[PDB]
Design a protein around this ligand. Structure first.
Ligand SMILES: OC[C@H]1O[C@H](O[C@H]2[C@H](O)[C@@H](O)[C@@H](O)O[C@@H]2CO)[C@H](O)[C@@H](O)[C@@H]1O
Length: 383
């Protein structure tokens, strides 16, 4: 091995290398990490406790690797779906808010961070993809996926395109795949059936086939990723994109007169985005669990704390009732919640990591022509 060898060092160098008396926080690079750092500076100014916010690449993969050895950040930020796996591996602490604090957040946000009956993270905000469109190029967005080919033909004649979004992450293609019947794991009798995966059915096939056909007919490019799509939309080159609340800040900066709205239907069915709750978990190896709790409950999850993050990159519909009442006025938030209602909240089971990896490969291989749609989804279904 070169993992059982550090089983020997971790005791000799006993025990744990997370620095006591400060907080290290990891959050994804597309989120308001500068705004979160402002909340951390307020904490430091009040309490003397230094807070360092980091946004490493692939943190959702690095965290279980480093936390398994007792290293990593004190606090990890990510959508709730990854947290059941972390908790199953013993990497997350059970969190302990009194009832007065729990009443400050929406009951459904607490449910996303409950694993085997216990709370394993603090919920921050509800994320759902919406259709984002350029009102100057497209005063009225398409109601259906099916009319997008004809729209692209029209826009292509003008050196524009209809739609670009990140084809590299299955998160972004899922709303179309799920629209006519795709699902991850079938939930029944109080639990997810890990042997009942729904990525190989007729509905999932129809959705992915529609996407592949878009690419075959030159209405999309298989290599489009997050940065390519964001640049194209914000430069005014494409009429539509698909993204979450965090993206609105850069569009504000851009020249673009944009709207946020319901995703198009497919075969008459609503697109069904998987809904994420951005959540903050506490590293089980952290010597700073009480510090982490004080920071999360009394500094971040306040009107002032969430505002600071939100002003950097919008959080979506926040879990904190008092602040959401102010944000609910925003039509972009209304659209987010409309898409969220039509979708469904992600599972947090340990199998989600394998699921996302399977679907990622399936979409990329089908989109690039390395596999047929049937072949790709059959593979993703198995196991
Ligand atoms: O694409 C698979 C990916 O989907 C979700 O990741 C989202 C995340 O929830 C959003 O907050 C935002 O950062 O975009 C990500 C997609 O690039 C799942 O949460 C994640 O576990 C999964 O791998």
């Amino acid at each position: 091995t070169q993992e059982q060898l550090e089983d020997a060092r971790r005791l000799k160098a006993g025990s744990g290398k997370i620095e006591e008396g400060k907080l290290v926080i990891w959050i994804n690079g597309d989120k308001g990490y500068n705004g979160l750092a402002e909340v951390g500076k307020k904490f430091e100014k009040d309490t003397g406790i230094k807070v360092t916010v980091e946004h490493p690449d692939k943190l959702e993969e690095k965290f279980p690797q480093v936390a398994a050895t007792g290293d990593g950040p004190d606090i990890i930020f990510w959508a709730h779906d990854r947290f059941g796996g972390y908790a199953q591996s013993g990497l997350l602490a059970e969190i302990t808010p009194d009832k007065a604090f729990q009443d400050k957040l929406y009951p459904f946000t607490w449910d996303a961070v409950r694993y085997n009956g216990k709370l394993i993270a603090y919920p921050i905000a509800v994320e759902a993809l919406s259709l984002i469109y350029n009102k100057d190029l497209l005063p009225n967005p398409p109601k259906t996926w099916e009319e997008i080919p004809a729209l692209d033909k029209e826009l292509k004649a003008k050196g524009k395109s209809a739609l670009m979004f990140n084809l590299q992450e299955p998160y972004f293609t899922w709303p179309l795949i799920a629209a006519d019947g795709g699902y991850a794991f079938k939930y029944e009798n109080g639990k997810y059936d890990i042997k009942d995966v729904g990525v190989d059915n007729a509905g999932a096939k129809a959705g992915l086939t529609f996407l592949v056909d878009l690419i075959k007919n030159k209405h999309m490019n298989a290599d489009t990723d997050y940065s390519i799509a964001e640049a194209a939309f914000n430069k005014g080159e494409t009429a539509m994109t698909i993204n979450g609340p965090w993206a609105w800040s850069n569009i504000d900066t851009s020249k673009v007169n944009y709207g946020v709205t319901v995703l198009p239907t497919f075969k008459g069915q609503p697109s069904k985005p998987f809904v994420g709750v951005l959540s903050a978990g506490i590293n089980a190896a952290s010597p700073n669990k009480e510090l982490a709790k004080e920071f999360l409950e009394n500094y971040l999850l306040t009107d002032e704390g969430l505002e600071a993050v939100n002003k950097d990159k919008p959080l979506g519909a926040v879990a904190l009732k008092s602040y959401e009442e102010e944000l609910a006025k925003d039509p972009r938030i209304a659209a987010t919640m409309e898409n969220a209602q039509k979708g469904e909240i992600m599972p947090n089971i340990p199998q989600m990591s394998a699921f996302w990896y399977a679907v990622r490969t399936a979409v990329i291989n089908a989109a690039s022509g390395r596999q047929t749609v049937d072949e790709a989804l059959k593979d993703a279904q198995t196991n």
